[PDB]
Amino acid sequence: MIKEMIEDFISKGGLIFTHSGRYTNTNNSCFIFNKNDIGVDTKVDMYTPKSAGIKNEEGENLWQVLNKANMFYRIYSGELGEELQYLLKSCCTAKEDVTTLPQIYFKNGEGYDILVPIGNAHNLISGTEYLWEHKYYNTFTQKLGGSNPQNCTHACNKMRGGFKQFNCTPPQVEDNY
């Protein structure tokens, strides 16, 4: 069931987000749902304390069912009901914490803004799925939560093999020339 799951999520801490500083630091717990970047194939992350939640008859938590066949966009555009839109949006909140997060200065013209860079969840999940699908092996793989990533993030709880990030090494200069 799906409503059962959305409410299982809500009895708990109940956060649905597209960006978070939880990937940068597991002690951080800042979860941000941006509205503008939600599209047809936008992967969407969610947080529960210790990734809690019941499974269905096929053994999947809410993170699997909300992320295949564009189900989160289907609930987001209300093809399955406007009261479900409400349930989804009740979990879609912006919780903020700046501790254990990077804080840099970016020039905004005759002044600076303290930007706190938090990582995009759609980038992590969709990039891991795509670069494993499209055989792109110029990459690093990192398990984010540590030994037991369920305290981090539902995607870190389920994708235990590690997230794919880009190997951004430049070409070297050969010294003997």
Binding site: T26, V98, G127, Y130, L131, K135, N167, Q172
Partner: protein
């Protein structure tokens, strides 16, 4: 009429290779633009653009995994757990020998400009890495375009960063056209209402998600226009090249 100061062979180790969540490796142009505005603050020489190239760069780790850092128990209140190993948050480290070239405008002799840049670099930190060594910086000027290329070829040997733009998104074209992605800036999500836990209480703060552009590495001599390698702070809370998209 353009003026540059070049610091060649900037051996830096301990570089925070975590450029973003999905990019680990060479520090992006936001890092070197931040280094440029850092000297605009400490030394007072106001910097328009920085062209940076990689002589050497190795991410610490294997070809598929980075070497994680053994964390130290430095938070408050978790004594008693300090005997066990500290939990590791992901921060890859790297070493890199760089060549930096700062567009500056200066009105004094080149010796005091070199001394000011040297005194900055002796107290600087490239991407969170201690600057292990660096050659004596030298001043070169770009009066014309041939002189611009003289400055360009004075960074030999280094692989500078040229912007090649975003067609659809980052993953698609990184597989298709095989270019490298890096942070060209950030996107502001929400205003931050709590300035207590920040560096300044008066500087306005935003949560950010890093936007990326797609870039290529070309040797500085093989770059036709040096403006396509000089990154500078654009007015879209991003950074950009002076020459635009490399073609």
């Amino acid at each position: 009429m353009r003026k540059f100061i070049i610091v060649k062979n900037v051996k830096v180790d301990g570089i925070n290779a975590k450029s973003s969540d999905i990019t680990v490796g060479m520090p992006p142009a936001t890092t070197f633009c931040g280094l440029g505005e850092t000297m605009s603050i400490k030394t007072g020489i106001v910097v328009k653009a920085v062209s940076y190239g990689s002589v050497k760069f190795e991410v610490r780790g294997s070809r598929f995994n980075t070497s994680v850092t053994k964390f130290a128990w430095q938070d408050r209140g978790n004594g008693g757990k300090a005997n066990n190993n500290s939990p590791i948050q992901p921060k890859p480290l790297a070493d890199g020998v760089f060549t930096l070239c700062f567009e500056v405008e200066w009105e004094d002799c080149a010796e005091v400009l070199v001394d000011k840049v040297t005194n900055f670099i002796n107290t600087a930190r490239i991407a969170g890495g201690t600057i292990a060594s660096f050659n004596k910086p030298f001043v070169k000027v770009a009066k014309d375009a041939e002189e611009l290329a003289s400055v360009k070829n004075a960074m030999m040997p280094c692989y500078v960063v040229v912007d090649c733009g975003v067609e659809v998104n980052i993953f698609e074209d990184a597989v298709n056209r095989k270019l490298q992605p890096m942070v060209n800036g950030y996107k502001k999500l929400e205003k931050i209402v709590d300035n207590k836990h920040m560096r300044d209480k008066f500087t306005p703060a935003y949560l950010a998600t890093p936007t990326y552009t797609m870039i290529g590495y070309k040797m500085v001599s093989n770059v036709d226009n040096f403006d396509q390698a000089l990154w500078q702070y654009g007015e879209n809370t991003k950074v950009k090249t002076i020459g635009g998209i490399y073609n």
